[PDB]
Design a binder for these strands. Structure first.
Ligand SMILES: [Zn+2]
Ligand SMILES: [Zn+2]
Lengths: 99, 82, 88, 109, 95, 99, 83, 110, 93
DNA sequence: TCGGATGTATATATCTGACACGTGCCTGGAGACTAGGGAGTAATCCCCTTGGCGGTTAAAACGCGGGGGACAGCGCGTACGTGCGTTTAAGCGGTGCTAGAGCTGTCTACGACCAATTGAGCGGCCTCGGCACCGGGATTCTCGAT
DNA sequence: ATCGAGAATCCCGGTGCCGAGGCCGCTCAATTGGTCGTAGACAGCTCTAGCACCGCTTAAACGCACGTACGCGCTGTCCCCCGCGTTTTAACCGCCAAGGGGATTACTCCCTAGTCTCCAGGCACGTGTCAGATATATACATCCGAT
């Protein structure tokens, strides 16, 4: 009889765990590699200082957290608890960046 | 030359970010869309930042130009100068 | 009615049509010549002076300025003569 | 008050006034700057800074810490109403987010 | 060689913090955030005053310019308190 | 046999009629009176240029038209065709005009 | 010259017409109260901004140019009334 | 171009240059204004105005009218997305909206 | 009286240069006047901020170039910078 | 599937007021010359950013059981679109009053500008404690068993 | 309802370490003073549009009755993320290297601010006239109860 939690309770525990915490979420090296991807795409032979990519990560995660707040609101609107594509497209339009 | 790096935004990273947003259950289709919107946001921000840097005849970008690019998008940020 | 190479000469540079692009005025010109007459000029049609700048943006966002049917016809009838201009 | 001292002290303030006056002048906002405008601006800046630091200090004391960190500033800005309305849009680095769970999402028997 | 001069509002924020909470310290990151906040608010108020002065064909940024800009920019109670304390400060300075 | 349209068809007809047309939609006298109420609540004895009232009303119709686009698609997100208040509060919340 | 509850002056057919321009068919019966509320809040915001511009210039009448300035300050720039 | 004519004609533009230079100098943007900035800015304005005017003229002609009205400007701005992206937050007096209805809102084919 | 300064005649001239037949109403003329003023303010403010960022004190051509690149979206910005540089070169020579 | 019923697109007279064009001048724009300082350009230096191992290991991928939740369908009883008669208050017109917006001229207290000056504030170093963290113990939700 | 086992969490203590804060050096930016050209305050004058009123027409709102679309709740089904256990890999920490370009200074020049004179492009003003609003008469697309 192994211990087995019901689905969602540990998810809520780590709701609290990652809201009371402040550390960065996206793994640093792949993220800065993706930033270098975009940079060399737009203009070749570009160099980055650490503070620049750290600020980029700050803004990126803030944007994603806000978008996820909005998508959670949208999902709650449809009497659902599982976020879905259409929630994301609705939020992305409604904030005004796609129209 | 390196490519196909959008997958660097891993599964549990997206799960943790959406979870910080108070989301419990995430459908399997969410992750590719999050990668796409993140890619678009990086494209815009990097475009503005590299424009700023190329203007100043500097071939290396700085956090000051990054935060200026954020501000110009109506996305000002605190904690790196300004 | 398939015109000969003389009509296939671009009306400006007197050279053949390579990657033809068709404006709404049915006027066609080569892509190097098209670029030279839009980016280096007043954004006017080289023949009737019409400005298709809005059309230019509309069909360059999707990169669909090229008229594929005419290019296929030309490469069917003048494959080697068009390959002559490929080298530089 | 008529005094021969720093303009901040004459105004009874701690923010610089001559420096603020210079940034009004050399900042290229108008070719002429009034004499009392920098004093007013310094007073407003001191009021806002005092209020936000007071809220941050209260939050830090509630967190058993005697030092201000970006998390405390983020909590102070978000929990306040009008400070939120002023700074609701902007994001603070290393600030986390408010502990907030939707009521519907709360567990049920 | 000698390093250039880097302006910051660290000492003034420290002074006001000691005036409010005499025993509370502050970290470097929070200090930089406070400096950036001061810079942002200063830029907003000064720009609003600049446009306002250009609006009425004026040429001087007077105290009334800053007062009206503050009334425009800050929310109600904050604007009222800021206006009151700024009026107190300016009348003390001119008196 | 009295003639009665099925519920909805004339609704679409008048949707098209109002979308293709650009006339003013709110009677100017009640709007002017309400604007005067707000003004006298702010400060007493103000005077109104007719162009100023026109600008107020144009801004108001722009705001309501945008908000109704947004709340309509928010309502149809929940598999519905009737817009109820919760659509409006959610749309304003996720737009960010009420926090 | 005080006035009474002219928010009712924004009559039900006005909201209906605005919603029809908004691309809707079916309107909930109690939509009107919060539509009036949001209209009202938008109004005191814009009127506050315009009135404080007018106050700044020793003027006792608000002009359309002040109104468009105020709308511009709210991220809602408007064209067709000068400037 | 060494022509000793007005700067608008000398540069081939059609918007004024002296007016733009004065506004830049008297607009309090910098203590010094470069000599090439006003003509460049006038050219940019000329491009944008030409684009919008030709779009509005096409819209009006498609509407069988010989005079651009604000509705035509609104239709030209919204129908294109590039300008609409440039002019997302702006509103036009007596502009109206694009005629469109969400596909779900359309009636069922019975 | 006082003199009023506007771009009405220039907009009319450009329209006739593009559309030699269609006219324009007064209200649309005001729309375009406000539009030109708005873009003027946007680009000028962006250029001033950008010059201040690099500690310069003069709006050269490249300042307006970068401002137009930032403000206008990509492809419109491309055509704008293209014929703006063309016009500057024409003015110089 | 279909034949009335109805709102919509289309063609023609008409007439009107906003739109397109001639005018004078004047006030802002163009041209010539001067001055001085902002910016470019050479050099250089040293801060830091890219590239590179290499051991560890926390976290990511993968598999699997399953139970919560998405979703389709049924049914209803409500809420709201539709249409018509009523009433009401907007919209237009015309007139009358004048407070205040706009313009002019005058005088001056405010503020730009330059030389001298000295201390406020920032750069660099040193230091003592506030919190990070490991380790342990009591507390505390959470799930199954009735 | 209940009670008990089991992971997870709050609380308490010792160790330590680097960084927040204080002190010294000193360089340059704020202070003070005086002067002078002037934007602005103020007084005065004009006359425009805003305000207020009247009366008339009728467009629109309003209320009621009604029939029906559907919002919501319930039920059942299935399917697919969640939680957990196992395995692997690249993130990561620490160290090391090279060079390159960001940043700084010093010099020179040429590019724009300023001044003045002169002059015509645009604008406030006045005037003709047809593009488009308005009404009436048509045909046509589309709807809906009924075959
Ligand atoms: Zn060619
Ligand atoms: Zn052509």
């Amino acid at each position: 009889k192994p211990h087995r939690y019901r689905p969602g309770t540990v998810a809520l525990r780590e709701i609290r765990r990652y809201q009371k915490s402040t550390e960065l979420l996206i793994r640093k090296l792949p993220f800065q590699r993706l930033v270098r991807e975009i940079a060399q795409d737009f203009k070749t032979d570009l160099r980055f200082q650490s503070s620049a990519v750290m600020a980029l990560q700050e803004a990126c995660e803030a944007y994603l957290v806000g978008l996820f707040e909005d998508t959670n609101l949208c999902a709650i609107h449809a009497k659902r608890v599982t976020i879905m594509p259409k929630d994301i497209q609705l939020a992305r339009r409604i904030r005004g960046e796609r129209a | 030359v390196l490519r196909d790096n959008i997958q660097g935004i891993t599964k549990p990273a997206i799960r943790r970010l959406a979870r910080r947003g108070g989301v419990k259950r995430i459908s399997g289709l969410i992750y590719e869309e999050t990668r796409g919107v993140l890619k678009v946001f990086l494209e815009n921000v990097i475009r503005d930042a590299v424009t700023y840097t190329e203007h100043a005849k500097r071939k290396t970008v700085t956090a000051m130009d990054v935060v200026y690019a954020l501000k110009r998008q109506g996305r000002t940020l605190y904690g790196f100068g300004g | 009615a398939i015109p000969s190479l003389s009509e296939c000469q671009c009306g400006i540079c007197m050279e053949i049509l390579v990657e033809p692009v068709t404006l709404p005025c049915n006027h066609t010109l080569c892509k190097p010549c098209f670029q030279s007459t839009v980016e280096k000029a007043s954004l006017c049609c080289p023949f009737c002076r019409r400005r298709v700048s809005s059309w230019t943006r509309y069909h360059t966002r999707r990169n669909s300025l090229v008229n594929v049917e005419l290019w296929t016809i030309i490469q069917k009838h003048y494959p080697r003569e068009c390959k002559l201009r490929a080298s530089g | 008050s008529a005094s021969a001292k720093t303009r901040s002290s004459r105004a009874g303030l701690q923010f610089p006034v001559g420096r603020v006056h210079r940034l009004l002048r050399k900042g290229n906002y108008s070719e002429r700057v009034g004499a009392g405008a920098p004093v007013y601006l310094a007073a407003v800046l001191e009021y806002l800074t005092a209020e936000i630091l007071e809220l941050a200090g209260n939050a830090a004391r509630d967190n058993k810490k005697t030092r201000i960190i970006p998390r405390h500033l983020q909590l102070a800005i978000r929990n306040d109403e009008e400070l939120n309305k002023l700074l609701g849009r902007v994001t603070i680095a290393q600030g986390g987010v408010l502990p907030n769970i939707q009521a519907v999402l709360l567990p049920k028997k | 060689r000698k390093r250039s001069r880097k302006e910051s509002y660290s000492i003034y924020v420290y002074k006001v913090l000691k005036q409010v909470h005499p025993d509370t310290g502050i970290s470097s990151k929070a200090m930089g955030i406070m400096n950036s906040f001061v810079n942002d608010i200063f830029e907003r108020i000064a720009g609003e005053a600049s446009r306002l002065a250009h609006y009425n064909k004026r040429s001087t940024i007077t105290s009334r310019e800053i007062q009206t800009a503050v009334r425009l920019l800050l929310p109600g109670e904050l604007a009222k308190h800021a206006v009151s304390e700024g009026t107190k400060a300016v009348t003390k300075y001119t008196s």
